[PDB]
mmCIF file of C-alpha atoms and ligand atoms in Angstrom:
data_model
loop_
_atom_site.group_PDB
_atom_site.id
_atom_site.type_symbol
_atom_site.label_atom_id
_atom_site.label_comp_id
_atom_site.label_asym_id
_atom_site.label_seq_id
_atom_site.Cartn_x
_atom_site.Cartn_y
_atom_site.Cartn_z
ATOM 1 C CA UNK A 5 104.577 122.095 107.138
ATOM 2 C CA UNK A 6 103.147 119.541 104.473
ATOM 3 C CA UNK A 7 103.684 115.867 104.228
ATOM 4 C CA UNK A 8 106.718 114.534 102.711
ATOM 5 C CA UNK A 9 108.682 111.692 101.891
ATOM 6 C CA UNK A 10 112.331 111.133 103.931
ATOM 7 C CA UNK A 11 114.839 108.881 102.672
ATOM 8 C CA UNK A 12 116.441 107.377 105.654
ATOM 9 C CA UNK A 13 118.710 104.566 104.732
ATOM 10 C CA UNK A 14 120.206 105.301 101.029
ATOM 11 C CA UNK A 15 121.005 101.888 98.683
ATOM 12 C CA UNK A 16 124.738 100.971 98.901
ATOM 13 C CA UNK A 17 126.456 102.380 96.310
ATOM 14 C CA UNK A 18 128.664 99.957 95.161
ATOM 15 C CA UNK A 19 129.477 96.211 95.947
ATOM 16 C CA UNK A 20 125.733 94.520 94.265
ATOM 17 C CA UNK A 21 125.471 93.490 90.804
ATOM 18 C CA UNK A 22 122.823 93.474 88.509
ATOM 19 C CA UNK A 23 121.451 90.538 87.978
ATOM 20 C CA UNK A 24 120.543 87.945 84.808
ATOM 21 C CA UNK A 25 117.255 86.314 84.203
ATOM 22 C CA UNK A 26 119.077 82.934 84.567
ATOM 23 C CA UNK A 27 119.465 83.430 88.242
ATOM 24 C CA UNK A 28 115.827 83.323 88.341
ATOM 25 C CA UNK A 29 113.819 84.098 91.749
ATOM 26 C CA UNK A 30 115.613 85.676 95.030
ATOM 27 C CA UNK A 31 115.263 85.971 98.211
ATOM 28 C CA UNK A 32 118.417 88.624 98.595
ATOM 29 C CA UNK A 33 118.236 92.392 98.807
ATOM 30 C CA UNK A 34 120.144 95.332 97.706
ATOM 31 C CA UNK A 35 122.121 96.225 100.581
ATOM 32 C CA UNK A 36 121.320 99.879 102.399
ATOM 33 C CA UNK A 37 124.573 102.114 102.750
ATOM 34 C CA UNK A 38 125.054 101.361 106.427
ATOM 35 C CA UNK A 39 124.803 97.335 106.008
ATOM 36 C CA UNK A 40 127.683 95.122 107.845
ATOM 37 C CA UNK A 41 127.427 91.150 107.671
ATOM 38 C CA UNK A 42 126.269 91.300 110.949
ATOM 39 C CA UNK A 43 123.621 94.186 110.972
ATOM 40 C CA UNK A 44 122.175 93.614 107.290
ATOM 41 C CA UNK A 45 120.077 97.373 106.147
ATOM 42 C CA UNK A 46 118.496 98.090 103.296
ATOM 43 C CA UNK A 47 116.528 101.581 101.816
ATOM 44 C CA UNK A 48 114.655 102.931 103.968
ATOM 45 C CA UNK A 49 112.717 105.786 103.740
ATOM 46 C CA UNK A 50 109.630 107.434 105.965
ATOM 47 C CA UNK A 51 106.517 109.446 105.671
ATOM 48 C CA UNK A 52 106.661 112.847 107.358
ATOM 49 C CA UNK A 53 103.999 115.301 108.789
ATOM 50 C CA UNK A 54 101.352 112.716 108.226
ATOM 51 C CA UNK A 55 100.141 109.887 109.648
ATOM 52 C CA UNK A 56 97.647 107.276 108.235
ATOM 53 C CA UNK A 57 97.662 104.967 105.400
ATOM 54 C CA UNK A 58 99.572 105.558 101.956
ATOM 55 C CA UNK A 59 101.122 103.918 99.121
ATOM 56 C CA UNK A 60 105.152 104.718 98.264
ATOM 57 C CA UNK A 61 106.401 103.072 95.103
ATOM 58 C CA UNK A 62 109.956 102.725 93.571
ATOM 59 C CA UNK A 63 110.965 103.410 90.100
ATOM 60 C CA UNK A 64 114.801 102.554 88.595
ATOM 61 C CA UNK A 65 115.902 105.890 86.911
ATOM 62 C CA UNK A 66 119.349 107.019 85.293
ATOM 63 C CA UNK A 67 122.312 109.141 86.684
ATOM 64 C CA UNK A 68 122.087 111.556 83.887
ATOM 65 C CA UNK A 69 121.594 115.382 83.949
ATOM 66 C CA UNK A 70 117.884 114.777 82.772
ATOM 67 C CA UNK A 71 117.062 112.143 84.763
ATOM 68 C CA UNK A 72 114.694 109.385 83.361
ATOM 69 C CA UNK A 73 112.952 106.257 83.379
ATOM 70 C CA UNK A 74 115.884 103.207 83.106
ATOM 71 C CA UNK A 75 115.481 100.163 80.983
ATOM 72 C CA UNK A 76 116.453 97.418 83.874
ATOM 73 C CA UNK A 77 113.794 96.020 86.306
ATOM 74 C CA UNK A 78 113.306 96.589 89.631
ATOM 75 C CA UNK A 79 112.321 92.394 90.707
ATOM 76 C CA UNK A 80 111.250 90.863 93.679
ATOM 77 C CA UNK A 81 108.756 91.133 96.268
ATOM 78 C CA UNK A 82 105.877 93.457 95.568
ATOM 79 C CA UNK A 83 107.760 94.177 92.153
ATOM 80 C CA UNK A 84 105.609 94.393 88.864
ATOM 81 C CA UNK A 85 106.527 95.688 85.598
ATOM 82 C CA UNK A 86 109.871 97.090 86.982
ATOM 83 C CA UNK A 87 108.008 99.300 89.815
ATOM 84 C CA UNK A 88 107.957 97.825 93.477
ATOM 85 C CA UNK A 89 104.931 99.226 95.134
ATOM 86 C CA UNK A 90 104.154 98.729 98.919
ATOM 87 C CA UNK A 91 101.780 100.508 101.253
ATOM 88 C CA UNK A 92 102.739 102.624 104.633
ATOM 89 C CA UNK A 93 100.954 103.365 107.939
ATOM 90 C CA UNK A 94 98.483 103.650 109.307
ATOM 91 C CA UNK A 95 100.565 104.200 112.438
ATOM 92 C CA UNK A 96 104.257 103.207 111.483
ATOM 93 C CA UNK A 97 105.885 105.489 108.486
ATOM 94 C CA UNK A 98 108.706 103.879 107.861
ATOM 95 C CA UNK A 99 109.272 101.644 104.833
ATOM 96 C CA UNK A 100 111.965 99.088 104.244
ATOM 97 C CA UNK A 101 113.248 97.642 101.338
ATOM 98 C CA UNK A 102 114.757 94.074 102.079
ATOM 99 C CA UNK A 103 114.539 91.307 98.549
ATOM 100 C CA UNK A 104 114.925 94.648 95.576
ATOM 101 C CA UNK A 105 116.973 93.395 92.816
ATOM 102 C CA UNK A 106 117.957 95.380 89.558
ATOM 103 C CA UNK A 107 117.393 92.633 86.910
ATOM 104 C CA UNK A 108 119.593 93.432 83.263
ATOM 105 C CA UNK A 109 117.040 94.259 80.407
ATOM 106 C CA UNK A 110 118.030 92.672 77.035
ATOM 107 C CA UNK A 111 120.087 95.102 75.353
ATOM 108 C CA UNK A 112 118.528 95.496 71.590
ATOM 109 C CA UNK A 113 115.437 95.021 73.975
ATOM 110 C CA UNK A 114 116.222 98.587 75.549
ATOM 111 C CA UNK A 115 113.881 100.677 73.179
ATOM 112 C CA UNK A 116 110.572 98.296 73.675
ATOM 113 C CA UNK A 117 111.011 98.472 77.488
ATOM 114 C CA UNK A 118 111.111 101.931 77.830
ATOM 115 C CA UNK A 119 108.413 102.708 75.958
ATOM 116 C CA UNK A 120 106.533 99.954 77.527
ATOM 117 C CA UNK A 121 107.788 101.509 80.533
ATOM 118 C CA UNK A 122 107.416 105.501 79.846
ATOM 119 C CA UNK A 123 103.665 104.496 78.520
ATOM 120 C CA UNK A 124 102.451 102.771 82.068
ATOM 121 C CA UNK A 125 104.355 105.523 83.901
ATOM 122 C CA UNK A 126 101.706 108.008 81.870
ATOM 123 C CA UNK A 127 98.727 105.859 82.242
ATOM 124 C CA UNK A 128 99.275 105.794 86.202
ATOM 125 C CA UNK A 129 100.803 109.362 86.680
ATOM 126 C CA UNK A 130 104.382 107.634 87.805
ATOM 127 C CA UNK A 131 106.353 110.978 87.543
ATOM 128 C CA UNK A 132 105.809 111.433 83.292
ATOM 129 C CA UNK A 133 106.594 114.755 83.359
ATOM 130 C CA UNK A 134 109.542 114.791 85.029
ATOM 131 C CA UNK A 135 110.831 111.204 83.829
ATOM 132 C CA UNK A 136 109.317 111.111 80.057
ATOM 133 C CA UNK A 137 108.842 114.211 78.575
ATOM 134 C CA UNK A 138 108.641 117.684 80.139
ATOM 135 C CA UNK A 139 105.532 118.103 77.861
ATOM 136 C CA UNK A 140 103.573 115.330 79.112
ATOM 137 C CA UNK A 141 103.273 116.796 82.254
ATOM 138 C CA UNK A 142 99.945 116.205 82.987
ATOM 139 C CA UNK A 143 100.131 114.000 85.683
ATOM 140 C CA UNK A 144 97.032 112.756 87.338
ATOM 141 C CA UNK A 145 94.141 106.222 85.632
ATOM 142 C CA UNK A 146 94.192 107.513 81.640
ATOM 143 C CA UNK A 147 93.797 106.805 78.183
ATOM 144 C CA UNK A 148 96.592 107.642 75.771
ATOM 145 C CA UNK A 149 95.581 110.300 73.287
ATOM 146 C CA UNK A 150 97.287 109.971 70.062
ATOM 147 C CA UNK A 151 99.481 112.835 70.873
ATOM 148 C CA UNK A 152 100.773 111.601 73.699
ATOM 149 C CA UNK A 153 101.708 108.407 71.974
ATOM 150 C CA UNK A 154 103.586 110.480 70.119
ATOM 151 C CA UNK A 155 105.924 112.027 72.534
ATOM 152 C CA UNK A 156 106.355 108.489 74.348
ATOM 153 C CA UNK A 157 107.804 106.868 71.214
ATOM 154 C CA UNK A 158 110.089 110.007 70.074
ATOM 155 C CA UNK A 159 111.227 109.944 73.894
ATOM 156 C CA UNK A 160 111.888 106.633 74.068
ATOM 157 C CA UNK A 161 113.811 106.509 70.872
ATOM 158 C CA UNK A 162 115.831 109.509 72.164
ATOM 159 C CA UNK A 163 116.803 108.183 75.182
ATOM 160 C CA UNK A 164 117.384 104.656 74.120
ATOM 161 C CA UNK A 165 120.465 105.685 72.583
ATOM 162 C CA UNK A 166 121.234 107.801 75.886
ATOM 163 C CA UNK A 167 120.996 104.770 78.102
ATOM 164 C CA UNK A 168 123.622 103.425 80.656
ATOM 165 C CA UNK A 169 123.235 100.520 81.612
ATOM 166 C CA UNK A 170 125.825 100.420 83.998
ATOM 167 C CA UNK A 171 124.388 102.705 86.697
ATOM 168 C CA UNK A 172 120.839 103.262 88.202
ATOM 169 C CA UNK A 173 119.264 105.389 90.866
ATOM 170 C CA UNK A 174 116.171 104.748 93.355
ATOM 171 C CA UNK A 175 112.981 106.912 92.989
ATOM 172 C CA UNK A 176 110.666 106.982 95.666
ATOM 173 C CA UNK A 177 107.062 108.613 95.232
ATOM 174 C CA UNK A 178 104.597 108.273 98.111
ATOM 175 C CA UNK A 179 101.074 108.894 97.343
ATOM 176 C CA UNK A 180 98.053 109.695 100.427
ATOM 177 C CA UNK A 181 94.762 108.591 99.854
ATOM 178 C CA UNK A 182 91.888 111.091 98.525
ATOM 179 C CA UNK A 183 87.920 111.549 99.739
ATOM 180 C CA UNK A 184 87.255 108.403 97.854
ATOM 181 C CA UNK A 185 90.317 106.017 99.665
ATOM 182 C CA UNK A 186 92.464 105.915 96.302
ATOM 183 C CA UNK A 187 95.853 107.056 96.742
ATOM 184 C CA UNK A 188 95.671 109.845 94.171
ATOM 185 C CA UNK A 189 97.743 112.814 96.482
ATOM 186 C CA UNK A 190 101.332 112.739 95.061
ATOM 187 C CA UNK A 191 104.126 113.918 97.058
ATOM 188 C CA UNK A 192 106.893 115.199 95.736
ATOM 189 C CA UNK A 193 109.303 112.286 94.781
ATOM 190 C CA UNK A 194 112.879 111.530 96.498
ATOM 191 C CA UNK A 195 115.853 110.279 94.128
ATOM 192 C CA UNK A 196 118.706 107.654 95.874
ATOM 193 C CA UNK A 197 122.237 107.828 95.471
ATOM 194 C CA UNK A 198 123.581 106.214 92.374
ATOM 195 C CA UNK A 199 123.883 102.399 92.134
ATOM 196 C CA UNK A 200 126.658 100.909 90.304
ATOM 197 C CA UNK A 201 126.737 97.672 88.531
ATOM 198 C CA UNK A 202 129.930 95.424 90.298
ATOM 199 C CA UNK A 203 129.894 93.071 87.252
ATOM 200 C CA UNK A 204 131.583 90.258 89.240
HETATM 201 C C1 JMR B 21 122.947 82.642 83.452
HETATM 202 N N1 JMR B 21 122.854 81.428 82.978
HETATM 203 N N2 JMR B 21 124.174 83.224 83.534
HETATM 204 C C2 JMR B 21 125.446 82.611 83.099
HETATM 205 C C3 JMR B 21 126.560 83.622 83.495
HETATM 206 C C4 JMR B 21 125.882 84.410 84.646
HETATM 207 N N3 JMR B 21 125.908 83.623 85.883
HETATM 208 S S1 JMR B 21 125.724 84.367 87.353
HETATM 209 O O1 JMR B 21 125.256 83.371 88.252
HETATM 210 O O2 JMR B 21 124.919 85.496 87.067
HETATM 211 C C5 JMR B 21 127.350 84.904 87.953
HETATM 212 C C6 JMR B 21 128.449 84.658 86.965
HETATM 213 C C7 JMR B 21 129.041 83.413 86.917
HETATM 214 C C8 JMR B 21 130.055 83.169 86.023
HETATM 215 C C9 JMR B 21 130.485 84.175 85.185
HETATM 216 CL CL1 JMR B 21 131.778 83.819 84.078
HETATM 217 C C10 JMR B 21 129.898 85.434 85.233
HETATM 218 C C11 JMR B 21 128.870 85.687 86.132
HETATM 219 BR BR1 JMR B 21 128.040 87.400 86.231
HETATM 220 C C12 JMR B 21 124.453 84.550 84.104
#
């Protein structure tokens, strides 16, 4: 059977807010379902039927029927551009997920963002068909053809008005290196139970 990626540990569901850009830096985590105050977990998920080094990144998605790229940011460690991105193995598979937080975008700002957001998830191969546009499905970096630029921004404009920003959900995408050492093999990606915004 062929590698894939296990989630483990799911986020908590509810009971973590979303946080503000005045709160600034943190060393806190989104909790994992099974956390207590005295056995702290967080996400987790694994690597299956392989063995050897990888890359898994996370992406913040929505709890629609169509389920796409989300407008809030993924922030803290190893988090860039609203996609944490860590590396497995070579031994070990299992991946932990300790200091995530889901940082408010400026609504009004909602539009810009995800089409800053849909356009890196096309140059990089971050799940576009699925999470942009069916039609951009060619996957896997890249240069934007004119075309494509065009879908992103009708997308984006479509969705912006879709958005909730009161719920997210975890994507996790491993990918295994090729001849060459990039990690350019792309397993099939794993979405998390919904995360809800406690707004207190
Ligand atoms: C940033 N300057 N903020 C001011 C209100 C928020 N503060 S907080 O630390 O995110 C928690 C908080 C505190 C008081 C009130 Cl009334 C609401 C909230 Br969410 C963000």
């Amino acid at each position: 059977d062929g590698p894939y990626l296990q989630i483990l540990e799911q986020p908590k569901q509810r009971g973590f807010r979303f946080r503000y850009v005045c709160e600034g830096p943190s060393h806190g985590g989104l909790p994992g379902a099974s956390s207590e105050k005295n056995k702290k977990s967080y996400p987790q998920v694994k690597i299956c039927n392989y063995v050897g080094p990888a890359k898994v990144i996370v992406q913040l998605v929505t709890n629609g029927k169509n389920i796409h790229l989300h407008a809030h940011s993924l922030v803290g460690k190893h988090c860039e551009d609203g996609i944490c991105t860590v590396t497995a193995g070579p031994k070990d598979m299992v991946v932990g997920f300790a200091n995530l937080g889901i940082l408010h975008v400026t609504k009004k700002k909602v539009f810009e963002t995800l089409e800053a957001r849909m356009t890196e998830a096309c140059i990089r191969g971050y799940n576009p068909g699925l999470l942009v546009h069916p039609d951009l499905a060619y996957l896997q970096d890249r240069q934007l053809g004119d075309r494509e630029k065009e879908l992103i921004r009708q997308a984006a404009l479509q969705q912006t008005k879709e958005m909730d920003l009161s719920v997210v959900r975890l994507m996790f995408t491993a990918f295994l290196p090729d001849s060459t050492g990039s990690f350019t093999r792309r397993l099939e990606p794993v979405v998390s139970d919904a995360i809800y915004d406690s707004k207190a």
